């Protein structure tokens, strides 16, 4: 109910007219295990309509694919099939395959799936996490620490990984930029202990420079979102990939090293960052 | 005359390897003014005031408890002091109080060793009250 | 190797890790202070050094006795800080006492 | 649910309490032998122990929201940092009695208004400071 | 953090029964065994003092 109302207030689903952008399929816990097991297939079919008939790029958001796995295990237990290791259904791999393999790119279109993943007992080696990870192609780790810093979206840049992050796919420039910003934050984290122990003045000149650039980058990661625009008061931005690459490579090169750090916080394209720097005081 | 002067204490460091004209020092066996090319003289300090006549012209004044005036053959004098204190932080009222108190203690110091200790106290206090 | 045993060992090592990290922080603070006043102590010690630095003095040929002042702390967990000093003292007392010089050691630490 | 299920006054004090206590948890490891630590760390440890003593509640003794707000206000603002750790609970009890009897109007304001208005905060500040000055005997 | 992760508690080092636990056990004994001797000697001196007076 909270998600429904929040989506209505954000505007992704409009009740007055046909301006909706999401279709909700709810498999609430009070339903029997079979229903919860098949809710994902229901939503996947609803997405399949747009990919095939309408030839569009759909986004299937399956929350807690772990509950899908658990529901499958419960259904197998009810059917009496001898449980597999840890107690998951004997057909865990096949069920997961049947569900995931329909979420692919056809000639008409493609269905991308952002699936929330729950890790039981914080065990990545657990059968359900392992089976789900076998089909994954990218990971987005929303970290409370990054939220504490104030960076929204609160994606942990170093921890978040993608499998298409290879030059042959993304492009040499894209890979260079992403690899660079990865290192520029890793070394900042590594030396962040050094400054904490000895001091900022106890760092090398380059060590002082990388801190400034990394702090600029970690702030530049934050981007205003259009869905929360009503509350935050700041128009949301949709930065193109080219603009993201240009801005981050510019920050890495040191072109905007003179700019203040706040100029890069909660901004869109790098032109907005420099304009904001101008606006300050 | 291009005489490197090192006045340092265990706590604080004063002039260190700095060219100075004269350094009047409260040394034992009499006070002798450190010169540009004074004869190498390893003499121990006594409570008193050190005046460093910096080549620029100003003469800084510090108070010295004890130590060694290590003036080498070359123009290098190492003035190590156990307690190197400036004149401002010293309190004149308590300086006088301590001087008079030690002078009173002199009579009560029956032991010649203890009387010698109170004698050291009164000597330091004498130099102290002269400084203040 | 029951899960109980594995859990016990894991918890123990976790506690050890936490304690060692906090100890590292405290040692870092103490080292920061000790390095700070090491600079004032440095020139003061150099003043003592200057004596034999300029007035080059060497033991004539032999001394009847000898003193070895090995300085160190009473708190361990500092690698070979004490061990190295003890080794040097042992090497010297082996190096000396062959010529007859009666070495004596004051163990500050 | 989070803060949505809290009175605005309780929200005001509890947010600060939560931040201070979280920081104390972060530095709790040092506490054992954290005497030789940065002054910020010492401040975090002191505020944490004070807040922890505040949170302790006797069994079968349910407290009213206004009284809880008063005690948490006493703690988060930092009027108890000077007070000795063991004395914190004694102050909690004595202050509870004092505010409940002498200053029931202010508790009514917190109860009725549902938020710590600026006037209440000023009045709360005065009451807490005055009692704290005289609390120790 | 996440509750699922294994959480350690006070005394785990000794509860394990490993080398570190044994070191802690012996170290406590060595200290207080010596302390008891000092305390016992002091008590003996106290007893002798009250016997004298």
Curated annotation (Swiss-Prot), chain E:
Location of region: N-terminal inhibitory region: 1-25
Q: Where is this region: Disordered?
A: 1-21
Q: Where are the transmembrane segments?
A: none
Q: Which domain of life is it from?
A: Eukaryota
Subcellular location field: Mitochondrion
**Family note:** Belongs to the ATPase inhibitor family.
User: What does the function comment of this entry state?
Assistant: Endogenous F(1)F(o)-ATPase inhibitor limiting ATP depletion when the mitochondrial membrane potential falls below a threshold and the F(1)F(o)-ATP synthase starts hydrolyzing ATP to pump protons out of the mitochondrial matrix. Required to avoid the consumption of cellular ATP when the F(1)F(o)-ATP synthase enzyme acts as an ATP hydrolase. Indirectly acts as a regulator of heme synthesis in erythroid tissues: regulates heme synthesis by modulating the mitochondrial pH and redox potential, allowing FECH to efficiently catalyze the incorporation of iron into protoporphyrin IX to produce heme.
Which proteins does it associate with, and in what oligomeric form?
Answer: Homodimer; represents the active form and is present at a pH value below 6.5. Homotetramer; represents the inactive form and is present at a pH value above 7.0.
Domain text: Forms an alpha-helical dimer with monomers associated via an antiparallel alpha-helical coiled coil composed of residues 74-106, leaving each N-terminal inhibitory region (residues 26-52) accessible for interaction with an F1 catalytic domain. The inhibitory N-terminal region (residues 26-52) binds the alpha(ADP-bound)-beta(ADP-bound) (ATP5F1A-ATP5F1B) interface of F1-ATPase, and also contact the central gamma subunit (ATP5F1C).
Protein's recorded name: ATPase inhibitor, mitochondrial
Organism, scientific name: Sus scrofa (Pig)
Residue range from the parent sequence: 28 to 80 of 108
């Amino acid at each position: 109910n909270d998600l429904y109302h929040e989506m209505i207030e954000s505007g992704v689903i409009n009740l007055k007219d046909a301006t909706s952008k999401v279709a909700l399929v709810y498999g609430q816990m009070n339903e029997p295990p079979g229903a919860r097991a098949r809710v994902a297939l229901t939503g996947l079919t609803v997405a399949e309509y747009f990919r095939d008939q309408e030839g569009q790029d759909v986004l299937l958001f399956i929350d807690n694919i772990f509950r899908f796995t658990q529901a499958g295990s419960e259904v197998s237990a009810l059917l009496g099939r001898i449980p597999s290791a840890v107690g998951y259904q004997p057909t865990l791999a096949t069920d997961m395959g049947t569900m995931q393999e329909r979420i692919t790119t056809t000639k008409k279109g493609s269905i991308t799936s952002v699936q929330a993943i729950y890790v039981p007992a914080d065990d990545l080696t657990d059968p359900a996490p392992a089976t789900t990870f076998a089909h994954l192609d990218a990971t987005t780790v929303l970290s409370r620490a990054i939220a504490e810093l104030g960076i929204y979206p609160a994606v942990d840049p170093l921890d978040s990984t993608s499998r298409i992050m290879d030059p042959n796919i993304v492009g040499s420039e894209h890979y260079d930029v992403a690899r660079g910003v990865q290192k520029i934050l890793q070394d900042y984290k590594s030396l962040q202990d050094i400054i904490a122990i000895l001091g900022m003045d106890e760092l090398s000149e380059e060590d002082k420079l990388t801190v400034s650039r990394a702090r600029k980058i970690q702030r530049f990661l934050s981007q205003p979102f259009q869905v929360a625009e009503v509350f935050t008061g700041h128009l949301g931005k949709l930065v193109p990939l080219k603009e993201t690459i240009k801005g981050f490579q510019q920050i890495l090169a040191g072109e905007y090293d003179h700019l203040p750090e706040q100029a890069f916080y909660m901004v869109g394209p790098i032109e907005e960052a420099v304009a904001k720097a101008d606006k300050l005081a | 005359g291009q005489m490197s002067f090192t006045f340092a204490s265990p706590t604080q460091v004063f002039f260190n390897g700095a060219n100075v004209r004269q350094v009047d020092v409260p040394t034992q066996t009499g006070a002798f003014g450190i010169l540009a090319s004074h004869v190498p003289t390893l003499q121990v300090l006594r409570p008193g005031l050190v005046v460093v006549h910096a080549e620029d012209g100003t003469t800084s004044k510090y108070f010295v408890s004890s130590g060694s005036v290590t003036v080498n053959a070359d123009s290098s004098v190492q003035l190590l002091a156990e307690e190197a204190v400036t004149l401002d932080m010293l309190d004149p009222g308590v300086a006088k109080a301590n001087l008079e108190k030690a002078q009173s203690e002199l009579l009560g110091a029956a032991d010649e060793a203890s009387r010698a200790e109170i004698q050291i106290r009164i000597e330091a206090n004498e130099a102290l009250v002269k400084a203040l | 190797a029951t899960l109980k045993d594995i859990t016990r060992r894991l918890k123990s090592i976790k506690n050890i890790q936490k304690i060692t990290k906090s100890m590292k922080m405290v040692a870092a603070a103490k080292y920061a202070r000790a390095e700070r006043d090491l600079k004032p102590a440095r020139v003061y010690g150099i003043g003592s050094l200057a004596l034999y630095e300029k007035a080059d003095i060497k033991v004539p040929e032999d001394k009847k006795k000898h003193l070895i002042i090995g300085v160190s702390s009473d708190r361990g967990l500092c690698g070979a800080i004490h061990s190295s000093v003890a080794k040097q003292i042992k090497s010297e007392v082996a190096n000396l006492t062959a010529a007859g010089k009666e070495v004596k050691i004051v163990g500050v630490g | 649910v989070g803060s949505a299920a809290q009175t605005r006054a309780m929200k005001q004090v509890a947010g600060t309490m939560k931040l201070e206590l979280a920081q104390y948890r972060e530095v709790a490891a040092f506490a054992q032998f954290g005497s030789d630590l940065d002054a910020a760390t010492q401040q975090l440890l002191s505020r944490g122990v004070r807040l922890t003593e505040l949170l302790k509640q006797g069994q079968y003794a349910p407290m009213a929201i206004e009284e809880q707000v008063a005690v948490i206000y006493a703690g988060v603002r930092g009027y108890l940092d000077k007070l000795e750790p063991s004395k914190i609970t004694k102050f909690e009890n004595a202050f509870l009695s004092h505010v409940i009897s002498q200053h029931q109007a202010l508790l009514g304001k917190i109860r009725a208004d549902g938020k710590i208005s600026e006037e209440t905060d000023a009045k709360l500040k005065e009451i807490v400071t005055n009692f704290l000055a005289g609390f120790e005997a | 953090d996440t509750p699922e992760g294994v959480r350690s508690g006070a005394g785990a080092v000794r509860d394990a029964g490993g080398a570190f636990g044994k070191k802690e056990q012996a170290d406590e004994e060595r200290y207080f065994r010596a302390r008891a001797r000092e305390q016992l000697a002091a008590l003996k001196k106290h007893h002798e003092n009250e016997i004298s007076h």
